[PDB]
Amino acid sequence: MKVILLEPLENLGDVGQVVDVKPGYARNYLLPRGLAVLATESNLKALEARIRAQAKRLAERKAEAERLKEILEN
RNA sequence: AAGGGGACCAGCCUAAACCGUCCGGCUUGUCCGGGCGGGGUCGUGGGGCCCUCGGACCGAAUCCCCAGCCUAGCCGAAG
Ligand SMILES: [Mg+2]
Ligand SMILES: [Mg+2]
Ligand SMILES: [Mg+2]
Ligand SMILES: [Mg+2]
Ligand SMILES: [Mg+2]
Ligand SMILES: [Mg+2]
Ligand SMILES: [Mg+2]
Ligand SMILES: [Mg+2]
Ligand SMILES: [Mg+2]
Ligand SMILES: [Mg+2]
Ligand SMILES: [Mg+2]
Ligand SMILES: [Mg+2]
Ligand SMILES: [Mg+2]
Ligand SMILES: [Mg+2]
Ligand SMILES: [Mg+2]
C-alpha cells in the first residue's frame, strides 16, 4: 500500500517520499496520526505540483541573486 | 437453443477525455475536491484535443388542440 510520507520517518523514508507499507500500518497508524497520506492519484499530482513550485521558486531565488552578482562585481 | 412462420415494432439519455463558472480546502496553485453548464455516447470502433476544407432537412415516448370513445339518453315501418 503506497503512501506519501508527510514527515521524515525512521528507516521508512524522507518527507514527500512515496514508500510501501502494509495496509494495517497505514490506516490504523500512519494515517490517523498525520504522519502520511495514501498515494492516490488525486493527491499524487498534488505532490508533483509542489515539487514544481519549489523547483521554480528556488531557482528564482538563484536567478535574482545573479542579477546582482553581475551588477556588484562590476 | 439456433433456425423458420407469425404478433408488435423504436430507439434513447448518460460516465470519462477537454473547456467554463461557482464554492470549499491550506500541501498556495498550471493545486486538490465538490456542484452546475458546455462537450460526448460508438464496434467498420467511437469520442476528446490541434491543422485544411465543406456551412437546411429530420423530429419526440414531452406539451397544446381536435376527431373518436366512455359516463344519461332519443327517433324508429305495418291490422
Ligand atoms: Mg443451438
Ligand atoms: Mg422468428
Ligand atoms: Mg469543476
Ligand atoms: Mg457535466
Ligand atoms: Mg451535458
Ligand atoms: Mg448530445
Ligand atoms: Mg447533449
Ligand atoms: Mg448533454
Ligand atoms: Mg446514437
Ligand atoms: Mg470488428
Ligand atoms: Mg480515433
Ligand atoms: Mg412512439
Ligand atoms: Mg425520449
Ligand atoms: Mg320507440
Ligand atoms: Mg312499433
From Swiss-Prot:
GO terms for cellular component: ribonucleoprotein complex; ribosome. Keywords: Ribonucleoprotein, Ribosomal protein, RNA-binding, rRNA-binding. It comes from the Bacteria. One of its GO terms (biological process) is translation. GO terms for molecular function: rRNA binding; structural constituent of ribosome. Belongs to the bacterial ribosomal protein bL9 family. Binds to the 23S rRNA. Extends more that 50 Angstroms beyond the surface of the 70S ribosome. Part of the 50S ribosomal subunit. This is Large ribosomal subunit protein bL9. It comes from Thermus thermophilus (strain ATCC 27634 / DSM 579 / HB8). The chain holds residues 1 to 74 of 148 of the full protein.
